[PDB]
Amino acid sequence: MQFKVYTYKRESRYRLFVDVQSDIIDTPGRRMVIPLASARLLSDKVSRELYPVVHIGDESWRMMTTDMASVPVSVIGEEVADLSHRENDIKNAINLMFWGI
């Protein structure tokens, strides 16, 4: 579901991802998602407009916008959070990646 955050059932580069696909767009067995990376070890000079910082499980995470990809429903694990309150920033980041200024 759009803006919901899930874990991967299979080993991957990242441990969490946010579903960003519209709920009215039907793609049987798959969903478009954006992985979340731990913000701790990462650099602060990285654009927050393109890579928003979110807070889940008492920690900060970076939305890896440019790592967007589709995942089969078979790898979608537990739902751990809901990022619908950051819709504005998520929307801005995605549009920026494709259409720029």
And the tokens for 69?
A: 């990809």
Alpha-carbon dihedral angle through residues 72, 73, 78, 82, given to the nearest 10 degrees: 90
Distance CA 90, CA 18 (A): 10
Question: Could you tell which of Cl ion, its own copies, none binds residue 100, using a CB distance below 5 to 8 A set by kind?
Answer: its own copies
> Amino acid identity, residue 73?
V
Instruction: Show the binding pattern over residues 64-83: x = contacts its own copies (CB under 8 A), - = does not.
Output: --xxxxx-------------
Binding positions for Cl ion, rule: CB under 5 A: 54-55
And the tokens for 82?
A: 């809901």
* Minimum separation from the CB atom of position 83 to Cl ion (A): 7
And the tokens for 3?
A: 């803006």
State yes or no: residue 27 binds its own copies (CB under 8 A). Answer: yes
Q: Binding its own copies by CB under 8 A: which of 48, 55, 85, 91?
A: 91
State yes or no: residue 41 binds its own copies (CB under 8 A). Answer: no
